[PDB]
Amino acid sequence: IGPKDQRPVRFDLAWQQEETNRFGTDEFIEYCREIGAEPYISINMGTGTLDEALHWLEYCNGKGNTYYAQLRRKYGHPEPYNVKFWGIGNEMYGEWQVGHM
Amino acid sequence: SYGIVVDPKEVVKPISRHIYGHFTEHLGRCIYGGIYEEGSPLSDERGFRKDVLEAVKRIKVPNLRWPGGNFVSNYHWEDGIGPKDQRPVRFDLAWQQEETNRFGTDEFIEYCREIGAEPYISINMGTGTLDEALHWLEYCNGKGNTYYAQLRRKYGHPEPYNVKFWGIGNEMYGEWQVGHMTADEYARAAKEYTKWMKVFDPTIKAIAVGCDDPIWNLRVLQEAGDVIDFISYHFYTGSDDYYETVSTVYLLKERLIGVKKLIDMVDTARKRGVKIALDEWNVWYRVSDNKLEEPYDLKDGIFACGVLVLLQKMSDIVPLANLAQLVNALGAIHTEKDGLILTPVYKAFELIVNHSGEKLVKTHVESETYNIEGVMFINKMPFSVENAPFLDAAASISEDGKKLFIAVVNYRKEDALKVPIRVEGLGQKKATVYTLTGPDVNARNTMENPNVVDITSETITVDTEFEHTFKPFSCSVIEVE
Amino acid sequence: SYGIVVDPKEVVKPISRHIYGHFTEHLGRCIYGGIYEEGSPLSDERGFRKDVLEAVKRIKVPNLRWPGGNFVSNYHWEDGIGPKDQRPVRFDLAWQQEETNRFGTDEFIEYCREIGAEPYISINMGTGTLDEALHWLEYCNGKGNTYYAQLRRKYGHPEPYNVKFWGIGNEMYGEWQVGHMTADEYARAAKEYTKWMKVFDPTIKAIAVGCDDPIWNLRVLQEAGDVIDFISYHFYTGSDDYYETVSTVYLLKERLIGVKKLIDMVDTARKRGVKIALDEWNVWYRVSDNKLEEPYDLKDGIFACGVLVLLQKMSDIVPLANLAQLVNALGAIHTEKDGLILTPVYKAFELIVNHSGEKLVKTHVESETYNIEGVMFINKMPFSVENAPFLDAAASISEDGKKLFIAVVNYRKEDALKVPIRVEGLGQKKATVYTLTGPDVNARNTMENPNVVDITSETITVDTEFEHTFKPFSCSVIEVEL
Ligand code: NA
């Protein structure tokens, strides 16, 4: 999120690639709006935390004065995205998953 | 009853260069006031103690473990990077000290480069996370455009450090460790950290935590034996009795054989060829505080000679070992504000490392043996050793084949030993015998008398058969040809 | 390259006499038609096969394990005592046979007495109870007025049997065992049976069940290491390949060192001096049925010789071992209704037990070595051995110090080895070499040709230094007067 040139480059463990993060939450939601699809976001339960998932939800869906709702507005979207479908982890049973359970 | 037969033409196996490793923890004066001292007139402009640097270079350190030890289990490596005046001051829970973080990752790597040692970094599994360990590995080893690789470049080192050895936690079994774990917790966590670190950099070697608890060791090997390279073992020994101290070289031998047998009992680990890292060892029994400035005497140096000889003979099973620790804390070297002392434990390394070959050759030793029951370590744990030898040896050859080294430990307290030696197909030649000993078993070096315990040399004449008299409580290397 | 140096004045350690033990299970024809055949022209008035008795006496059995083996885990010993006609016929789940119980505790002890062996009885922990095992122990060993001590007397033996070795269950880890247990279950049960049995008779030696699972072994040692005397290990090996079979002597060596190291890692067990009982071992790979009449050949006999040599060298760690089994079932001896065959596995014992000392002396062996990857056992499980020797030896001396025995195994498949031997302080004199040998690695004895594989004797002259030529795939003992 935020100005693209300032997003960090990460190493994705799943597919061993440098991820530039130049496609992120705002670009995905914009893609969904363009095609008329409801966004369905999966959360990170491998290296992620409860706080982190709540913050993603706040950023996407928050209507109030909270930090992340305000952050979504700052980055150019005052209206909430209203993401309806949330995936509570991905394949957390599999030993190939980071942080499997 | 005593004798040594060597065949220089029969190479048994290589000797791993990494048996002569060392370790520096953020403990007491090991780092601050030890290797590193900003504003000492004895330090260079990086803050490296130059007298210490000289003594460290002389023992040709193959790899250096850092930053712990108990310290690492509450250490956040990002606190130790960037402009020094912006690093945060932290309270270290392990040794109850304010840590300024002015010695951090980049300074450690610079220290390794200066002394020619490979870095061996332990990670924080106590308060740390998987992401945090991956970020450290990326900072050190990343050659791409990821955030942490670029951060290393930004702080002044474009070329990756290529840290080859990574310690997957420290003593995670011990209630004294921050965030200590059960066997099943640690075994699962060791597998998780190691496997993902190797996704990022498949070239690294991973050392997982072992201990004296065989269930702990088996859980680790069973869970993580498909990905780890070593399981570690920490061995601290000693009492005021000379034999009780030196005999424990052979206690250590049995401990190592035990751990090797555990590896043999886990199919994945056995097949993969998982080995042992003896990544903390020394005498430790006198001092129990947050500084550990153990006053080593020659008794303790003879133990260290015995361990190095043992490791030459067992490095196929134990390829990596690290004396704990290099300076001040359980220190091989002891510093004061105006100088340093080389303890007899340092002298053990100064002897062996400079007079040893890269390949072990056939060595048969005849020796009288003894049995002992004693106490060891700070808690005076009882132990026993059966059939500990009075005389032990290991012959090695240089990589080119031009030099033979016959390391010989006479553990005999009371008597010199006149030992017949045979060296297959050896001409008549002169050789140099380097000898480490002192006036008595409790001898020490001091600031004013720095050479009480030291290496002396004599020229002797050598043949296919010869004799040599080995002084009591001594270690010698006969260097031939 | 090859050489042996012996010093008869340097005694390394005693050799436990119980490394030469044997084992008879109620399995196929081991008992019925094997040691025991009622009404046979070849049996005595007790029903003991007399030809078998002679062969068994010839190998000086120090202890004999009975009645199992998998059989014991569904055996109720009271079924096998009292007037033979009134013993109930039972269905044995282990080998799926009707067991008549006409051979029971009293017949077994009488057999042991006849052959001079110490009885070693395994108890039933599968369908058995603590009371049941205590009653068996009371029947055998009780000398007071208790019901079962009196019952032994009533059935014709006033004197107690003094059974010294008790096996605390059999292979309780295996799903094939009736009433099999988890490690924690077995460890707890072993402690319970052992401690109460020893309250009744504190003199007995208790052998607990070990296996290849190190967690199993450690649970047993941790929970019962204060009361047990041995942890057991069962080792079965072999394949059609000669080297794959004999090299596993040195696989066994490493397995035994491993279990010894586990004992060392458990303080109670280490301080008590718990040792290993190798209480089933043999080649077993060809036959997989309810009779197990494995047709042993010379290759397998050389394996057995190698194990016996190994055990002489390691008996301080492994003081008790039992070949599985004595007759027919994995049998050292094979019977038919009209005679018997001495297999090469039998011959290994005939050689070593008759030509061995009570103390091990200093023996140094120079030998070329080889590495091997092979398969072993009925399931062809993969194994590897590093640096197995082509030549091995163990020297021992008699109790009185008057005789020296140099046991030598030449594992080479094709080439004889002329080996230089040094014996410290030995005079110039004659000696006898006894040699187990046969024409090829697959040689066997048969009814028609009972002596294809046999022990030869020859006179040689020895001195402080001498040479002897050892046949390939052979075991020799050089017996020397001192
Ligand atoms: Na006893």
CSV table of N, CA, C and O and ligand atoms in Angstrom, one decimal, chain C residues 198 202-205 229 272, ligand 1:
chain,number,residue,atom,x,y,z
C,198,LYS,N,10.3,-59.1,41.9
C,198,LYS,CA,11.5,-59.0,42.8
C,198,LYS,C,11.2,-58.9,44.3
C,198,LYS,O,12.0,-59.1,45.1
C,202,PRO,N,13.9,-61.6,45.2
C,202,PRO,CA,14.8,-60.5,44.8
C,202,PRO,C,16.1,-61.0,44.0
C,202,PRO,O,16.9,-60.1,43.6
C,203,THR,N,16.3,-62.3,43.8
C,203,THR,CA,17.5,-62.8,43.2
C,203,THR,C,17.4,-62.9,41.7
C,203,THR,O,18.4,-63.1,41.0
C,204,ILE,N,16.2,-62.7,41.2
C,204,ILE,CA,16.0,-63.0,39.8
C,204,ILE,C,16.6,-61.9,38.9
C,204,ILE,O,16.7,-60.7,39.4
C,205,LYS,N,16.9,-62.2,37.7
C,205,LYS,CA,17.3,-61.2,36.7
C,205,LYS,C,16.2,-61.0,35.7
C,205,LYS,O,15.5,-62.0,35.3
C,229,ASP,N,17.4,-55.7,34.7
C,229,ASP,CA,18.8,-56.0,34.7
C,229,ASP,C,19.3,-56.0,33.2
C,229,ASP,O,20.5,-55.8,33.0
C,272,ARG,N,23.0,-48.6,37.6
C,272,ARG,CA,22.6,-50.0,38.0
C,272,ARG,C,23.4,-51.0,37.1
C,272,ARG,O,23.5,-52.1,37.5
D,1,NA,NA,19.8,-59.0,41.5
